[PDB]
């Protein structure tokens, strides 16, 4: 049997579990299935990347562009102000999903309108990322390393920017063949200059939609009936809605902000909540027992 009490990673003060016996059972199920049955479905910004480091806020993939040298100061001020205004709505504990939804759509429209006007060149994304302050969570090498060693499918489902995200994991040496990225990917003109975004918008509250539009990916992993889902938002809880068959699913949520106001809700909807946690130690220990 699995005993969380015997696992010190689980007894750290940042680990909040509402139903420990159910988490035990779920983890026992993952262990029984092993590699052969495991897949990972994970958010990106503030789930695989850090929310803050040494007391300062770390950038999302969008923030990497907001802050980079390829954007004029005037634009950056506009972008900072949209961020202040729209982040406040995104995390607002008082507002329902349906109240927030149209403001999230609007944030993306305005942000992405301004980025297109700046004409970001594809060829500069590498430098922009290398000069950025982005940080992946502690333990990211062993997370991706262990998954790739056992050929475990990893689906990264991000409402961020796909090109930037890929470049971050590429520079960190963890963009392995088992990793699939679904995000908002830049459309470039004939000069390799940004003119728009491809496909349909993925935002904070419509991951259900793109989950169902990837049933090709999911129907090839029908045997991968044991799922570990990681997210930091309530909208991430929908990322596994396109999975073919679910036998055991464990949901791990990073609660990074408005902790006291959001804790009960997070504990009710995620199996394990990780409060102001900048490492992947908990999921790494699960992987260590499973693979
Ligand atoms: C549109 C926009 C979104 N974002 C955030 C909103 C979400 O929290 C996050 C989406 O990435 P995620 O789905 O990987 O967490 O990006 C910005 O930081 N800046 C922006 O301009
Ligand atoms: Mg996120």
From Swiss-Prot:
Annotated binding of CMP, by residue: 90
Positions that bind substrate: 158-160, 207
Keyword Nucleus attributed: no
Tissue: Isoform 2 is highly expressed in the brain, heart, spleen, kidney and blood. Isoform 2 is expressed (at protein level) in the spleen, skeletal muscle and gastrointestinal epithelia.
Keyword tags: Cytoplasm, Hydrolase, Magnesium, Metal-binding, Nucleotide metabolism, Nucleotide-binding, Phosphoprotein, Transferase
Ribosomal protein as UniProt keyword: no
One BP term from GO: CMP catabolic process
Residues bearing PTM Phosphoserine: 233
Catalysed transformations (reactions): N(7)-methyl-GMP + H2O = N(7)-methylguanosine + phosphate; a ribonucleoside 5'-phosphate + H2O = a ribonucleoside + phosphate
Localization, UniProt: Cytoplasm
Molecular function via GO: 5'-nucleotidase activity; magnesium ion binding; nucleotide binding; transferase activity
Annotated residues for binding of N(7)-methyl-GMP: 90, 111
Active site as annotated: 43 (nucleophile), 45 (proton donor)
EC annotation from Swiss-Prot or TrEMBL: 3.1.3.5, 3.1.3.91
InterPro entries per UniProt: HAD-like_sf, HAD_sf, Pyrimidine_nucleotidase_eu
Binding, Mg(2+): 43, 45, 232
Entry GO CC: cytoplasm; cytosol; endoplasmic reticulum; mitochondrion; nuclear body
Database matches in Pfam families: UMPH-1
Superkingdom, taxonomy of origin: Eukaryota
Function, in words: Nucleotidase which shows specific activity towards cytidine monophosphate (CMP) and 7-methylguanosine monophosphate (m(7)GMP). CMP seems to be the preferred substrate.
Subunit structure: Monomer.
PANTHER family tied to this protein: 5'-NUCLEOTIDASE, CYTOSOLIC 5'-NUCLEOTIDASE 3A
Sequence similarity: Belongs to the pyrimidine 5'-nucleotidase family.
Protein name: Cytosolic 5'-nucleotidase 3A
Lineage: Eukaryota, Metazoa, Chordata, Craniata, Vertebrata
